[PDB]
Design a protein around this motif. Structure first.
Motif, short mmCIF file in Angstrom:
data_model
loop_
_atom_site.label_atom_id
_atom_site.label_comp_id
_atom_site.label_asym_id
_atom_site.label_seq_id
_atom_site.Cartn_x
_atom_site.Cartn_y
_atom_site.Cartn_z
N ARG A 1 42.45 50.95 41.97
CA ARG A 1 42.03 52.26 42.51
C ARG A 1 42.52 53.39 41.61
O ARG A 1 43.57 53.26 40.97
CB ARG A 1 42.62 52.51 43.91
N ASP B 1 43.37 57.97 44.88
CA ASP B 1 43.36 57.16 46.12
C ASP B 1 44.77 56.92 46.69
O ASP B 1 44.92 56.67 47.90
CB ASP B 1 42.65 55.82 45.91
N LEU C 1 46.87 59.23 46.78
CA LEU C 1 47.22 60.55 47.28
C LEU C 1 46.26 60.98 48.38
O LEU C 1 46.18 62.18 48.70
CB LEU C 1 47.17 61.56 46.11
N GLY C 2 45.52 60.03 48.95
CA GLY C 2 44.64 60.33 50.08
C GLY C 2 43.15 60.34 49.76
O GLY C 2 42.32 60.58 50.67
N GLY C 3 42.81 60.08 48.49
CA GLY C 3 41.40 60.06 48.06
C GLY C 3 40.93 61.44 47.59
O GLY C 3 41.43 62.46 48.07
N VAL D 1 39.02 64.82 47.24
CA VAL D 1 38.27 65.69 48.14
C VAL D 1 37.25 66.50 47.39
O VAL D 1 36.48 67.26 48.01
CB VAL D 1 39.19 66.61 48.96
N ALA E 1 42.83 65.36 44.68
CA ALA E 1 43.23 64.70 45.92
C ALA E 1 44.10 65.59 46.79
O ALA E 1 44.66 65.11 47.78
CB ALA E 1 44.01 63.37 45.62
N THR E 2 44.20 66.88 46.46
CA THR E 2 45.10 67.75 47.22
C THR E 2 44.25 68.87 47.79
O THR E 2 43.81 69.77 47.06
CB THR E 2 46.29 68.30 46.34
N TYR F 1 41.29 54.00 51.89
CA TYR F 1 42.15 54.87 51.07
C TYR F 1 41.72 56.32 51.24
O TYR F 1 42.45 57.24 50.84
CB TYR F 1 42.07 54.51 49.57
N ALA F 2 40.53 56.53 51.82
CA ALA F 2 39.97 57.90 51.88
C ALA F 2 40.47 58.66 53.11
O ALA F 2 39.67 59.05 53.97
CB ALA F 2 38.45 57.85 51.87
N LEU F 3 41.79 58.88 53.15
CA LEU F 3 42.41 59.46 54.33
C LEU F 3 41.98 60.90 54.54
O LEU F 3 41.82 61.31 55.68
CB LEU F 3 43.93 59.39 54.25
N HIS F 4 41.80 61.67 53.46
CA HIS F 4 41.32 63.04 53.62
C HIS F 4 39.92 63.06 54.24
O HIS F 4 39.63 63.87 55.12
CB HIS F 4 41.32 63.82 52.29
N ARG F 5 39.05 62.17 53.77
CA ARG F 5 37.70 62.09 54.31
C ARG F 5 37.70 61.63 55.78
O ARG F 5 36.95 62.15 56.60
CB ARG F 5 36.87 61.14 53.45
N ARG G 1 38.68 64.57 57.89
CA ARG G 1 37.56 65.52 58.09
C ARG G 1 36.54 64.97 59.10
O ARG G 1 36.03 65.72 59.92
CB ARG G 1 36.87 65.85 56.77
N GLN H 1 46.09 49.03 53.71
CA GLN H 1 46.50 49.25 52.32
C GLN H 1 47.71 48.41 51.94
O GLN H 1 47.77 47.84 50.84
CB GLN H 1 46.81 50.72 52.06
N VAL I 1 51.88 59.82 56.59
CA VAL I 1 51.93 60.67 55.41
C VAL I 1 52.13 62.14 55.76
O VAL I 1 53.03 62.79 55.17
CB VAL I 1 50.67 60.47 54.52
#
Lengths: 419, 419
Positions: A126, A130, A132-134, A136, A334-335, B71-75, B78, B120, B297
């Motif tokens: 990855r 990924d 760091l949260g994927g 955006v 990712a931030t 892994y897409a925690l930000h997505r 949202r 993960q 996180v």
């Protein structure tokens, strides 16, 4: 996934005579490349400053990392802190604020942390984003980092960029960089000429490039009084005014009396500075920088802290190569709170790099997040060897913009509250 | 590693008649178990509240997660925010502070985030602690969570713990829990009896258990005046005084006049509360709680923020099972600033659980970080079925300590600034 070995390589590469409050950039910029290798042969890359005292700490820390696991970032941080011990590494220019114990530890740690994340990404197949949260955003916008500059270093060949010593020259430089990279934001490095001349250049940029956010960065060269006069004169023109004056106190006084937000990478540069900053409000914008805030994860934590308190994020740059550019890009992608265009010196390095060429490109002013695993870059070992050989004979061991300027103008001193 | 399906299962389990400022715990406590399954069949577990309005939001969000990457925690965050939309989910007791849009989103998100981290970790063959920087301690200390309680629920069998309605009874309860679990810190839930009686119990605990840190938690049942009198009376006895009085203002006034730090999980419960808290200083200690701060996180980011401002961290608990206990433990183990013993209701659930028994144990008051990959727990699907069947017929759909207390004492109302 234990670390087997950590290779530390100082490098030097060519830099134009970019002027700033502290003097002028030297003909060689220094960096230290770090490569972490696991027991099973997976490699990760990091990139940090090349100043001798820092290089010595990075070597000492590197020698004490074998046997630690690449996921054990807290443990690696404590080991770096043990090695740094009582040392506080200072720099000669001051353009990233004061030195401290934590900032010294964070500076040493960050080269290793980035390399460990590169390895974790490779292990997971990855991108670092990924971890760091994927991402955006698919691409990270960067600004055009304009500088007043001589045509070349005295006694050396002139470079392809041309001199820029007045508004016309700065506008021409902007056309050149924007034409090549597609930057949609513009920053001018100031603290070089009297403020009224730099304001003139900003106005010329506004007229030549309608719609593009503009920033001006005097690196604390101005008094409070002057800063307020300039900020008011530039009402409605700047995205932000970056470090007009020295210190939290002076910055807070300016911020209260100018119409645009202030930004810094000088009076808030380590976490211990944040409670005073929240109380006095010297800034509306923090330029984060993983190279001295302690790596990507710590930088992400700071971004959350800033957003909570209403402080927006941009990103500070020093002359750097593609490992740093990849790390900058994954962090910003990712931030969620890094919403302003990031700074980069990339154009000034004119294609010099230690990674293979195809991974990092600018498209319409932004760097798309690399697709490969980890940072998405590949070390070019010959290129690393070329730059290491340059380091060996370049005759520079610690960055010294002021000493270099003094070799031409003996009376010069770093401008700090000067105009 | 795309999400294929998300299974959402409400459960109910037995809880003793634990008294608090809001009344008394009902005979069934509710939770929602979440299981995320990837396209390739890897599973992750999360655990959250069982209140009906919350359960409805978790189901709605779950239905909209297939196709997103773990892994897409930000997505995923949202998407949860989109589903929650305008809904703000409130609770009936108020013991974790006010409701808000962000807290509602964070509450819904956290069940999924924990499950995604479990996955993960499994993919990487690493414990969740390794996704958070690696454990900095091998085991996480927990406190003995003491409550005044009836011998049993009226009309139902008495439990094995006995009543505790005075200092002797509380000390006996302490001996029982400490004997079984080895807790090295003690918390007393207050706001039940007049403050002088609860102070007496604290003193009795101090005499019976020299050396063990003590906390008292009235859940905002006291006036400012009373809080100050009690804090002063307990000088040198409490690790911290938790939520003596309601509101940031009242807490700040108390904190300035008592010798021990104040803590909260009521007046600072979402990030928007932190700037006011930093300004007024209602607390020296924040009880973090991933179940409403938005997952592991985000909780780690908040811990960094608190440490920066000199606010120390503990951890708040609600009645919970082993998925929550595993998540609590990985978070605390891997977060340098969580340095106070964490709270847990575990003893009160008397062994009820939906995970297999051998992974989480208390040794000398602390839970060793599980060794397996991910959270280190395994869903027991029969046990989940048993608790889901209990939910179906338990006759409770939303936690209501006050309504339950009112069924016995019609004049009762939640104690808030009461003594």
């Amino acid at each position: 996934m234990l670390i087997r070995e950590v290779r530390v390589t100082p490098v030097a590469f060519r830099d134009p005579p970019l002027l700033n409050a502290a003097g002028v950039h030297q003909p060689w910029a220094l960096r230290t490349i770090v490569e972490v290798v696991t027991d099973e042969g997976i490699t990760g890359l990091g990139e940090t400053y090349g100043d001798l005292a820092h290089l010595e700490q990075v070597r000492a820390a590197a020698a004490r990392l074998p046997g630690l696991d690449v996921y054990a970032l807290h443990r690696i941080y404590r080991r770096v802190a043990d090695v740094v011990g009582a040392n506080i590494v200072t720099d000669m220019h001051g353009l990233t604020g004061s030195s401290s114990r934590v900032k010294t530890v964070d500076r040493v740690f960050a080269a290793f942390e980035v390399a460990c994340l590169d390895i974790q990404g490779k292990a997971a197949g990855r991108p670092v984003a990924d971890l760091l949260g994927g991402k955006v955003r698919d691409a990270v916008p960067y600004s055009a980092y304009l500088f007043y500059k001589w045509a070349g270093h005295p006694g050396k060949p002139e470079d392809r960029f041309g001199p820029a010593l007045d508004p016309d020259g700065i506008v021409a430089q902007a056309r050149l960089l924007i034409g090549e990279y597609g930057f949609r934001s513009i920053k001018l490095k100031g603290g070089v000429f009297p403020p009224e001349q730099e304001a003139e250049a900003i106005q010329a940029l506004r007229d030549a490039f309608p719609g593009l956010p503009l920033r001006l960065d005097p690196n604390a060269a101005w008094t409070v009084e002057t800063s307020i006069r300039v900020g008011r004169a530039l009402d409605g023109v700047l995205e932000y005014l970056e470090d007009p004056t020295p210190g939290i106190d002076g910055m807070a006084r300016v911020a209260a009396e100018v119409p645009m937000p202030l930004a810094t990478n000088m009076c808030v540069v380590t976490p211990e500075h944040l409670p005073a900053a929240v109380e006095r409000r010297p800034i509306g914008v923090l330029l984060i920088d993983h190279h001295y805030w302690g790596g990507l994860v710590r930088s992400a934590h700071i971004a959350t802290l800033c957003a909570t308190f209403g402080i927006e994020l941009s990103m500070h740059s020093n002359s750097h190569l593609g490992i740093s550019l990849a790390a900058m890009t994954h962090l910003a992608a990712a931030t969620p709170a890094i919403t302003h265009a990031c700074d980069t010196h990339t154009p000034w390095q004119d294609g010099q790099d230690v990674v293979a060429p195809g991974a990092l490109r600018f498209v319409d002013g932004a760097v798309p997040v690399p697709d490969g695993p980890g940072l998405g870059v590949e070390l070019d070992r010959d290129a690393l060897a070329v730059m290491h050989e340059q380091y060996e004979r370049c005759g520079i061991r610690t960055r010294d913009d002021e000493g270099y300027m003094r070799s031409f103008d003996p009376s010069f001193s770093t401008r700090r509250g000067f105009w």
